[PDB]
Amino acid sequence: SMIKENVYFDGNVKSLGFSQQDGESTVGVMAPGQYTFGTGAPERMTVVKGALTIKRVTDADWVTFTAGEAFEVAGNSSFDLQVEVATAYLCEFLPA
C-alpha cells in the first residue's frame, strides 16, 4: 500500500516503490546476472552500493556505473544490465 514491492526475473530483481509529494521513486536490488528492462518515461538510476554494467541504445560499448554514479535511460526504450555483485539502486523519474 504505502510501500509497493515488485519482484522481477524469478526473484533476482526486487524493488520498493514509495511516494513523496512530487510522486513515486523506487529503491531496489539486482542479484548477480544479466537482465533487460524496458522504459516508459525516461528515468535516472543511481547506484547505491555495488555496480551496474549497462548497454543502452546509444552505448557502443558496455559501461560500468559504480556506487554514487548515475545514468539516464531514454523514454520508451530498453537497456541491458550485467550485475557482478548484488547491487542496490535508486530509480527516479526525470525532473519536469
Add this chain to the structure above:
Amino acid sequence: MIKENVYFDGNVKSLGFSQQDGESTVGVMAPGQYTFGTGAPERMTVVKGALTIKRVTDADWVTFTAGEAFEVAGNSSFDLQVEVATAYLCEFLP
C-alpha cells in the same frame, strides 16, 4: 538471494543482499514514528528523503537528509520520525 523483510504493518520494508563484504540492506520507511533495536552497530545512509532520529546519546532529535549518514551503537535502540517516505541503506560498521 534478495530477502524482503516487512515491519510495522507494512510501514517499513527492506531488501537484504550479500556482497563479498557480507550483508547489507536497502529499505523504505513510510511517514510515521518508529523504534528499532540494534545488535551489531549499524551505519545508516539516507538515500532519498530524511530521517529525524533520537539515539541514547542524542539530547535532542537530529535530522539527516539525503546523502548523509549516521551510526547507531551496538546492542542499543533508537527512535525515528519520518515526515516523507524515505529510502535508506543500512550497513554493518567494521
